[PDB]
Design a protein around this ligand. Structure first.
Ligand code: HEM
Ligand code: HEM
Ligand code: ONH
Ligand code: ONH
Lengths: 201, 201
């Protein structure tokens, strides 16, 4: 990922906020020069992405994790709100379309996690916390988690580098930008909200 | 990506449909064992993903494409609708949460495309076609496209292998499945629609 200057994060906490808000990530390895990717829920431990630790799990039947045992470098992609930007919205000419989005790419060394029950229980807690009502596992469900453990593989990534893209129409003049934000306010409020926070500081 | 049997596509056209419907893709290379990824619009040429050709573009200032000149194998990830599945919706116990999603992973040999204007013009046509009204470039905008060309790099992927995941609650018993579909019908109609099509044949 390349980040033009005008799409860079305005604050270092913006990257961590995106990661926490969008835990359904893409975990990517380079198995002997061939990229392999798994979609998996991944949570953040720490205040910042760079230097932080990511925790996730996948299916034991998914052979991807067997590439982790050597502890190679992996890439974890977190994707926030996104949406196609049509020049119909710009109301200007000439023009070209684009796609608006935010994402965090975290790269670091993967390792298998022995404490898989802790990882999955922390993932439940993180993903249910913003819901009302939130689901709390019954004691029977916690026993079910224990029974499921032989079929899961948990892992940690120690993040060496972080890059963040906030591609949110900052390349447009102010009158056009306002039109884009108004259009997403109806069609994609999560993206409009992200545009608003990107202008902060 | 690993695809359990009950999440496999029911029809071979399902993968192509997802690709056409979700052109904002992730292009992934293995630059000397390190995964690198760029978010870019990618369109499909052909009736099937496997054996088909993908066409995309990226920023020339993005150094990712300089890894393509040797024509390595790349992975292109197309992501359809997705959403967190809370056990609150299941109304059963014991239970564990999951994430529902659909995706197509296309792997093949990348090559730079000299015909960049054709690629970007076909991308405009594909992404505007489902809109009403659709944006058609003015002659002035087509000249603007020509003026932008030195700053863009277009590329082709010849897809050798395709895998498709339709992880859409098929592991749940029928009464629970019905509850999931009803909940997404309100919260995420694109995902509910995908659940409906997954049961076809
Ligand atoms: C918010 C909570 C959770 C989410 C979003 C989630 C999501 C997922 C996803 C997307 C996969 C597929 C990974 C792959 O393709 O390799 C998976 C696999 C798996 N997870 Fe979770 N999971 C959650 C909680 C749990 C818990 C609490 C356990 C308890 C041990 C668990 C155990 C498993 C197992 C055994 C598998 C592999 C087989 C299966 O799909 O049932 N997960 N999970
Ligand atoms: C549906 C139509 C289009 C979409 C969704 C789209 C989207 C994008 C995206 C996401 C990028 C950033 C890629 C990266 O990070 O490396 C990009 C870059 C670029 N694209 Fe497009 N594009 C479209 C049409 C066009 C057209 C018609 C042209 C005309 C030549 C063009 C020229 C460029 C150029 C010059 C760049 C790099 C600098 C810039 O961002 O302006 N694109 N495009
Ligand atoms: N940044 C230029 C060209 C964008 C082409 N890719 O989206 C514009 O906004 O007109
Ligand atoms: N497939 C099991 C466990 C799912 C855990 N990961 O989502 C269930 O649906 O209960």
């Amino acid at each position: 990922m390349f980040v033009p200057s005008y799409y860079a994060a305005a604050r270092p906490e913006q990257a961590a906020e995106l990661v926490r808000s969008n835990p359904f990530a893409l975990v990517v390895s380079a198995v002997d020069g061939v990229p392999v990717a798994t979609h998996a829920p991944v949570i953040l431990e720490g205040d910042a992405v760079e230097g932080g630790t990511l925790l996730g799990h996948m299916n034991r039947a998914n052979p991807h994790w067997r590439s982790f045992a050597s502890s190679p470098d992996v890439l974890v992609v977190f994707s926030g709100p996104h949406g196609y930007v049509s020049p119909t919205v710009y109301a200007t000419d000439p023009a070209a379309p684009t796609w608006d989005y935010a994402a965090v790419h975290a790269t670091g060394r993967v390792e298998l996690a022995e404490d898989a029950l802790d990882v999955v229980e922390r993932t439940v807690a993180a993903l249910e916390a913003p819901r009302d009502p939130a689901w709390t596992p019954t004691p029977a469900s916690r026993e079910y988690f224990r029974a499921l453990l032989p079929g899961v593989v948990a892992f940690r990534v120690r993040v060496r580098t972080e890059q963040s893209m906030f591609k949110l129409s900052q390349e447009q003049p102010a009158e056009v930008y306002a039109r884009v934000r108004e259009a997403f306010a109806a069609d994609n409020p999560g993206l409009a909200d992200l545009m608003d926070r990107s202008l902060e500081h």
